[PDB]
């Protein structure tokens, strides 16, 4: 691709510069080029990939929600709101397709860290979930099942291989519970998953890691917030 002539280490370096400059589309392009070199990504590099694409798709979701709300209130006079919502929607789907293609073609493997395997399967569940936020037809069922399957496989690994305070395990369970509540229309599943995750992290709080405990305690607070919202 466009990044094929650049050295891997230069791509990582430039992804970090782009983060500093808040140029997240650039930083995602740099990290996509890094992934396409075909070597595994370290934890720090997975964070770069994650931050870039989450920033890009987050702006698209935010835009799509604004336009969709305008579109729904105007359905209570021309084609313009729908066409522009469809435009942003198509771009969002393209970014999710790009991320999911990278996960399938390069990143999701049988080997490697529990951390890496759980994180990428979590990523796959998330980007299927973002596709499901804008899906409607026969696609929507296919996409919702794909999200669940990826989340569930990540959950199985994290529960076997990871302490209950691990921030990837926590963030996965947080995002799966959001899937249950907002996408799958299964509230009770979401409260029970979120409560089980919080309580189990709390019961084994001594497993907090000194290089990540701030991340763990952030996610357990977000679990509590969702539980307070949902109850």
């Amino acid at each position: 691709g466009a990044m094929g002539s650049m050295e891997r280490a230069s791509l990582i370096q430039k992804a970090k510069l782009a983060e500093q400059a808040e140029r997240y589309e650039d930083m995602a392009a740099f990290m996509k080029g890094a992934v396409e070199k075909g070597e595994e990504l370290s934890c720090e590099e997975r964070n770069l990939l994650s931050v870039a694409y989450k920033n890009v798709v987050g702006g698209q979701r935010a835009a799509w929600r604004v336009l969709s709300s305008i579109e729904q209130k105007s359905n209570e006079k021309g084609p313009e709101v729908r066409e522009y919502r469809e435009k942003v929607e198509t771009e969002l789907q393209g970014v999710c397709d790009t991320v999911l293609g990278l996960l399938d073609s390069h990143l999701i493997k049988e080997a490697g860290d529990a951390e890496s395997r759980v994180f990428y399967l979590k990523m796959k569940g998330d980007y299927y979930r973002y596709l499901a936020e804008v899906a409607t037809g026969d696609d929507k069922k296919r996409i919702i099942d794909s999200a669940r399957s990826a989340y569930q496989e990540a959950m199985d690994i994290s529960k076997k291989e990871m302490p209950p305070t691990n921030p990837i395990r926590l963030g996965l369970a947080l995002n799966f519970s959001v899937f249950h509540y907002e996408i799958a229309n299964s509230p009770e599943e979401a409260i029970s998953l979120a409560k089980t995750t919080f309580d189990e992290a709390m019961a084994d709080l001594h497993t907090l890691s000194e290089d990540s405990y701030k991340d763990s305690t952030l996610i357990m607070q977000l679990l509590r917030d969702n539980l307070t919202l949902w109850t």
């Binding site: 994650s50 987050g58 998330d126 959001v178 907002e182 979401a190 952030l218 996610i219 919202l229």
Partner: peptide
């Protein structure tokens, strides 16, 4: 008010 998912960090 929607649910809160995992945020960006670091």
């Amino acid at each position: 008010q929607r649910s809160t998912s995992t945020p960006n960090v670091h």
